Design a protein around this ligand. Structure first.
Ligand SMILES: Nc1ncnc2c1ncn2[C@@H]1O[C@H](COP(=O)(O)OP(=O)(O)OP(=O)(O)O)[C@@H](O)[C@H]1O
Ligand SMILES: [Mg+2]
Lengths: 113, 240, 1077
């Protein structure tokens, strides 16, 4: 991310059969698979680089990433159940208490007597 | 003060300035010339230079009105063309990006008249009004600075009438869809030339112009160095 | 490295002394040695006899305190011919050219027969030395009269390295033997023979003044005075072995001077103690070892750069004060010991002399920081750092070099109060020879303990301390001192810690059944201010609580109380310069605004919480296209808005924060630009009506935006949150960007640049803006003081009428330069320090030839690499190739987000750009002439307003200061939103329109923020104009003039100033009051 937060994203997608399809299966050629995989990697890389993790997490909740993947990869081959399967945090930079407080939105004591 | 006309032919047309408390007989000076052009919309027009600030057609209605009454001449100015004080309309971004919905100096504008009888009447009246400043500067007309148009520009912070906006978007979207629909049918309608050449149009192409623009915007690898008798002899030559 | 190597050579030759002066001085002191030999001897004399001898003479003996009294002075005095010798940098021939002037150190060795074995006790040796310096001074004087040389020689006493115990004679030349052109001064040091006193008795731990406490300072002075030629011989050997010794030495000397480091003492208070000799001795010590394993850290084959790097690296990493010390042998491999003496120590076993005795703990910590800071710049490969390392003086201003400065005026200052002189006592006299050394420590310890962790480094400086006195006097005379204290007043300089400078509570030792020693000192130190308090975690600790104020930091209160309680109940501590800057920040009209600290961003966070409430509502509504993301980009979202957000304060220009709304990618977007914008407006209509129905508590309205030229169909939705905040929404579509790129392509060639300008503004608002707000927001957390200074900087620009032409984002990038690239200084830690550094940078910035490129990263990735770094400079050279004078583009600000470097700095007229640099130069020049004070600060923030050709005064019908949210007020939005404009300030819009109408002739300026710079009522703003030189004079009439002119001849016209005033007058309507042409 822009915060120097190194992370690993896993995406999963499945082919679907058209409305008027008659074939039992909906397999895609390996050329389509490689084409779809390239598009997905571009979108995942683009969003993470141009966003903070707090921004990235804000994207995960509404699943806007999946809808973006749908439209981009759609012309290649119809797809279903597009999701960001997993997110890992490989490395962290130096901890910043100031940034942490801002994300969460000091206190005097009471005289003991 | 004695200057009535400039030698290049631009007649000086002084105006009396208004009185304001912050600013306690100052004048503003226009420079005008008869306009000639074969273009119909530019015909029957008058060059005007050094316009006052925010000078609309309703302003021109007043100035010609006083001249008509003072010099008992019948003169109507139909519209003021090319009036861009601020240069907002110097370029038409709509026309340039596409043809659908838009088929298309500075400190100057063209004042068109209803007929030739009106403009030549004003030009003669303008010449006399030019002579006034030399003799009787007091009787020079007074320019306002106040119009129903002026106050609207003054009130920069005005929320737009939502009802008006909705109607404007509705009509514009309706018109654009019709033009877009017509264009797409034209390209994908099996265009054939008079000599039986059929144009090639790809799927998803929407406008014929873009095909024209696409055209405007836009053996060595298969050759073998060692195949023929002369080629090998040439290699033999460079070998030794 | 080759570039660095060549750059070093240019520096050495530039500062190389001219050899002719060496002969000139060598001609003199060679003869001066003959004069010394002419000086005859004494017989044995007691103090009574020598006192009578010098009773009538012009010379007076410079006896060191405590002066010898008849009872304890029974030891006699004698003089004999010294063993004359030359020492110092001149002996090693390593000196350089110094415009202020250098010094030649000549050593005279008192013959050993003049001393007894116990002469190092009770100043016995010192007083013998002092009289020995007298007959030298006395009978040197008459021989100079005999030789006619007295006409152009001025003689005066001085303290060697500001050492009160070692007075010396200084020979200087005024306007054949006249050496004033040499800018040299001969110093006569009267040293003792080698090994007269058992060095073991002179160790720092031992004592030599009877009263037992140790006497490190007194022991050093006698022992160092007896070891001068020995170190010269030691340094002479190393110079022969390694060929780059002198080149390394001059680099060290140049580095030290720029950091304000000298060989003078630091116990007195001045920063120093580490000079050329200490740097040279350290380099020699490292050349014979230096590691824990006694391995060589420097090799004789090293070049100048390598020798310098090793010494700098050694200081930066290895600790010589608290944990560990270095021992070497002048006469044996140097080894690093882990044990530390709690003071800077570089022991010499051969001589039993600690070379860093003059080096104070507080000064040492700063030295280590500077060495560590440079070691980072030295390892840097992306950027050239030669100029910063060697060719930049950071000691010119204390305010720039130090975050906060307090001057404490001591009471009764022709002697200190009896209480204060009483505190000195005998016990500290033996430890600390002079009261100034004692008081310097006393301020440091209490100030260090009181502030504790709140500060990084502390320096106590005695302003107005003299070190030379006339020969007729025995001790230096201060006007305030009266021979009692040689200083006018004491100044406390601090390097604050931004993360924790503003903590409300000073934590202390935890509670226990039996009060621990740490608990005891804490309670005694703070007295009544101490207390025992409990916290939510359940811990019980001794802590004292302070109160935050918007005018001064917490540190001001702590030092004021801490010094008064311990130092003197009559001390006067005053740091008013920081107070003025704090008041110049607008005070928000929020609850408890005065008590809020300037590091508190609670106002900004409250705005963000209101945004999140609106954020949820937008996402959950159902629209034809799903909402991809809502990105806030407003000024307040990066902690840079000049005035903090205030609920319902809609007169503020920055009230409506822009927000970028992005929908899911679709193919249904219009292919034509105006259709695309009207399609965008259609989406905002649904957001308005759905919001109106479901959430009636929100109010909304539509306004037109014309920032992008020629795109007149932009419509933005303004949302008035119930909390009292405004948000402006604009729709971003992926097709929109390519439509512009289509525009540049299809446009005619002459028109192509103009469309590029339109595209340039578009990317500045839609694309680059998101990246800017994202990085600035994240970076600002590490740089706490960035938000206050950039707000103050924008306040400064508005007073001078520059924000109208400088886009706010350009100001931020200029304001962040001292933070991301603090070299050679430190990161700003005070509002005063940060703002002045910004002005200092602008003053010395040659924007015509030097680009400004920034690495927007947190303090030591996204750091600019060499490939990227080279790429950006290539852009600058290419742009300057076409624009060498810089008329079209002046400031080149580039970074990772902006590699083009022209995105935020386009369209600024040249006079404005020069004015911005002109004011900066004036501001720095004013500070140099007049020190930072109340008058100077006011002059900085007051506009001259006389340079402009014509000046127009405007008054708003109502004062907007209350509605702007500024505490010298609305509580709800008007029922009819048309009423909003009745409480707005349009003059900024007025100027913008007039600029574009009179672009070819006039450059009008105005104050964007009237509520801050519009007087008490915030209703007065001024429109200032400038006629270009061309149209100022008469011109021939042409249709292309594009100017409002009046005829003078048939083909001659002149600018009609009077008519323009009418158009400004009617265009201002009632607001205009007065004109000044
Ligand atoms: N900290 C010290 N410890 C021991 N001896 C010292 C110390 N400082 C100076 N001396 C002695 O004093 C002599 C002169 O000191 P000084 O600081 O003037 O030397 P320098 O490096 O030649 O000076 P400059 O920078 O003026 O050329 C040195 O040669 C050394 O003999
Ligand atoms: Mg010296």
């Amino acid at each position: 991310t822009s915060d120097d937060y190194v992370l690993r994203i896993f995406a999963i997608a499945f082919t679907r059969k058209q409305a008027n399809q008659v074939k039992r299966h909906s397999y895609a050629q390996s050329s389509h698979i490689r084409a779809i995989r390239k598009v997905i990697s571009e979108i995942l890389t683009k969003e993470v680089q141009g966003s903070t993790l707090a921004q990235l997490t804000s994207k995960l909740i509404p699943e806007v990433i999946n809808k973006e993947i749908e439209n981009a990869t759609k012309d290649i081959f119809p797809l279903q159940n597009i999701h960001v399967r997993k997110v890992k945090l490989l490395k962290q930079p130096k901890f910043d208490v100031g940034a942490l407080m801002a994300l969460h939105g000091e206190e005097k004591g009471k005289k003991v007597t | 003060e004695d200057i009535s006309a400039m030698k290049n032919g631009f007649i000086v047309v002084p105006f009396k300035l208004p009185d304001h408390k912050a600013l306690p007989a100052s004048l503003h000076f226009m420079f005008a010339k008869r306009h000639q052009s074969s273009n119909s919309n530019e015909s029957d027009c008058l060059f005007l230079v050094n316009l006052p600030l925010l000078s609309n057609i309703e302003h021109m209605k007043k100035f010609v009105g006083q001249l008509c009454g003072k010099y008992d001449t019948v003169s109507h100015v139909e519209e003021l063309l090319y009036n861009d004080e601020f240069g907002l309309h110097e370029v038409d971004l709509s026309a340039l990006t596409s043809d659908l919905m838009s088929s298309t100096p500075r400190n100057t504008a063209l004042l068109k008249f209803v007929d030739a009888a009106s403009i030549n009447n004003c030009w003669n009246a303008l010449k006399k009004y030019s002579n006034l400043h030399a003799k009787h500067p007091n009787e020079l007309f007074e320019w306002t600075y106040t119009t129903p148009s002026f106050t609207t520009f003054v009130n920069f912070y005005k929320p737009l009438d939502i009802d008006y906006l909705k109607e404007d978007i509705h009509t514009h979207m309706a018109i654009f869809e019709q033009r877009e629909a017509q264009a797409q049918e034209d390209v994908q309608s099996s265009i054939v030339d008079e000599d039986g050449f059929t144009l090639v149009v790809g799927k998803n192409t929407k406008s014929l112009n873009s095909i024209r623009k696409k055209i405007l915007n836009k053996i060595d690898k298969k050759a073998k160095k060692d195949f023929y008798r002369f080629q090998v002899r040439e290699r033999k030559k460079q070998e030794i | 490295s080759n570039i660095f190597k060549l750059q070093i050579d240019e520096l050495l030759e530039q500062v190389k002394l001219k050899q002719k002066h060496v002969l000139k001085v060598e001609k003199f002191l060679h003869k001066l040695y003959d004069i010394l030999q002419e000086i005859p001897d004494w017989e044995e004399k007691s103090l009574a006899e020598v006192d009578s001898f010098f009773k009538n003479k012009i010379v007076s003996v410079p006896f060191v305190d405590p002066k010898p009294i008849p009872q304890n002075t029974n030891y006699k005095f004698n003089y004999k011919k010294p063993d004359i010798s030359l020492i110092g940098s001149f002996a090693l021939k390593a000196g350089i050219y110094q415009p202020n002037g250098s010094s030649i150190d000549t050593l005279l060795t008192m013959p050993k027969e003049l001393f007894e074995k116990k002469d190092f006790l009770n100043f016995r040796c010192l007083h013998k030395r002092s009289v020995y310096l007298a007959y030298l001074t006395h009978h040197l004087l008459i021989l100079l009269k005999k030789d006619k040389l007295d006409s152009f020689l001025q003689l005066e006493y001085s303290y060697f390295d500001n050492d009160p115990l070692l007075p010396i004679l200084r020979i200087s030349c005024s306007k054949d033997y006249n050496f004033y052109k040499t800018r040299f001064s001969i110093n006569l040091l009267i040293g003792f023979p080698y090994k007269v006193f058992e060095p073991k008795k002179l160790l720092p731990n031992r004592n030599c003044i009877r009263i037992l406490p140790a006497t490190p300072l007194y022991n050093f002075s006698v022992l160092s005075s007896s070891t001068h030629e020995n170190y010269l011989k030691y340094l002479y050997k190393t110079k022969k072995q390694t060929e780059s010794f002198v080149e390394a030495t001059v680099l060290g000397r140049l580095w030290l001077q720029q950091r304000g480091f000298s060989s003078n003492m630091s116990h007195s208070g001045s920063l120093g103690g580490f000079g050329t000799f200490e740097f040279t001795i350290l380099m020699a010590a490292l050349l014979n070892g230096g590691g824990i394993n006694s391995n060589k850290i420097l090799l004789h084959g090293f070049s100048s750069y390598q020798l310098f790097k090793g010494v700098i690296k050694y200081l930066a990493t290895m600790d010589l004060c608290h944990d560990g010390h270095l021992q070497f042998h002048s006469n044996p491999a140097s080894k690093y010991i882990d044990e530390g003496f709690q003071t800077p120590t570089l022991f010499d076993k051969s001589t039993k002399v600690n070379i860093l005795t003059k080096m104070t703990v507080s000064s040492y910590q700063i030295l280590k920081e500077y060495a560590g800071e440079t070691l980072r710049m030295l390892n840097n490969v992306v950027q050239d750092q030669f100029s910063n390392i060697f060719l930049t003086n950071i000691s010119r201003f204390d305010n720039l070099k130090y975050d906060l400065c307090y001057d404490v005026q001591l009471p009764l200052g022709n002697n200190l109060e009896t209480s204060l002189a009483a505190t000195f006592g005998s016990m500290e006299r033996v430890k600390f020879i002079t009261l100034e050394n004692f008081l310097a420590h006393k301020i440091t310890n209490v100030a260090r303990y009181a502030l504790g962790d709140r500060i990084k480094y502390i320096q106590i400086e005695m302003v107005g301390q003299k070190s030379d006195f006339p020969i007729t006097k025995r001790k230096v005379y201060s006007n305030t001192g009266g021979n009692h204290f040689n200083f006018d007043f004491v100044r406390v300089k601090l390097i604050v810690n931004p993360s924790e400078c503003d903590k409300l509570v000073t934590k202390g030792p935890a509670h226990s059944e039996t009060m621990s020693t740490e608990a005891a000192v804490f309670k005694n130190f703070w007295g009544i201010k101490s207390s025992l308090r409990r916290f939510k975690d359940g811990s019980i600790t001794h802590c004292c609580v302070w109160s935050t104020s918007s005018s001064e930091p917490i540190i001001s209160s702590i030092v004021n109380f801490a010094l008064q309680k311990h130092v003197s109940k009559k001390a006067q501590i005053s740091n008013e310069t920081i107070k003025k800057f704090h008041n110049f920040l607008p005070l928000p009209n929020l609850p408890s605004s005065a008590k809020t600290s300037v590091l508190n961003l609670s106002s900004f966070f409250n705005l963000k919480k209101s945004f999140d409430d609106l954020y949820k509502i937008i996402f959950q509504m159902k629209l034809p296209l799903s909402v991809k993301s809502i990105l806030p980009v407003g000024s307040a979202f990066r902690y840079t808005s000049l005035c903090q957000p205030v609920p319902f304060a809609y007169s503020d220009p920055d009230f409506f924060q822009d927000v970028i709304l992005e929908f899911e990618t679709s193919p249904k977007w219009p292919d034509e630009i105006t259709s695309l914008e009207k399609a965008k407006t259609a989406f905002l209509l649904k957001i308005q009506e759905e919001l109106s129905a479901n959430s009636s508590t929100y109010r909304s309205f539509f306004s037109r935006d014309e920032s992008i030229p020629y795109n007149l169909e932009i419509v933005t939705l303004n949302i008035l949150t119930p909390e009292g905040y405004g948000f402006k929404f604009r729709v971003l579509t992926e097709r929109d960007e390519i439509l512009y790129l289509r525009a540049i392509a299809n446009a005619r060639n002459e028109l192509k640049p103009e469309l590029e300008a339109t595209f340039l503004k578009f990317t500045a608002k839609y694309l680059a803006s998101v990246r800017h707000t994202r990085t600035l927001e994240n970076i600002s957390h590490s740089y706490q003081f960035y938000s206050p200074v950039v707000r103050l900087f924008k306040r400064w620009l508005d007073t001078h009428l520059l924000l109208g032409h400088i886009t706010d984002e350009l100001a931020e990038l200029i304001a962040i330069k001292p933070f991301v690239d603090p070299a050679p200084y430190f990161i700003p830690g005070s509002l005063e320090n940060g703002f002045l550094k910004v002005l200092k940078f602008i003053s010395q910035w040659n924007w015509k030839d030097d680009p400004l490129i920034l690495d927007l990263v947190k303090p030591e990735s996204e750091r600019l690499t060499l490939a990227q770094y080279k790429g950006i400079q290539m852009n600058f050279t290419n742009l300057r190739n076409s624009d060498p004078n810089g008329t079209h583009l002046q400031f080149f600000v580039a970074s990772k987000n902006d590699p083009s470097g022209i995105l935020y700095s386009s369209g600024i007229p040249l006079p404005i750009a020069t004015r911005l640099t002109a004011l900066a130069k004036v501001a720095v020049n004013l500070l140099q002439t007049h020190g930072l004070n109340q008058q100077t600060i006011n002059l900085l923030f007051t506009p001259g307003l006389k340079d402009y050709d014509f000046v127009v005064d405007l008054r708003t019908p109502i004062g907007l200061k209350s509605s702007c949210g500024i505490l010298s007020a609305p509580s709800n939005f008007p029922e009819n939103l048309n009423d909003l404009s009745e409480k707005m300030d349009p003059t900024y819009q007025l100027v913008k329109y007039l600029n574009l109408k009179y672009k070819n002739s006039l450059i009008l300026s105005s104050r964007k923020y009237i509520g801050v710079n519009g007087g008490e009522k915030g209703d007065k703003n001024v429109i200032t104009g400038l006629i270009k030189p061309l149209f100022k004079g008469a011109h021939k009439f042409r249709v292309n003039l594009d100017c409002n002119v009046k005829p003078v001849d048939d083909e001659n016209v002149i600018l009609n100033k009077e008519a323009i005033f009418h158009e400004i007058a009617a265009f201002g309507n009632d607001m205009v009051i007065n004109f000044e042409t």
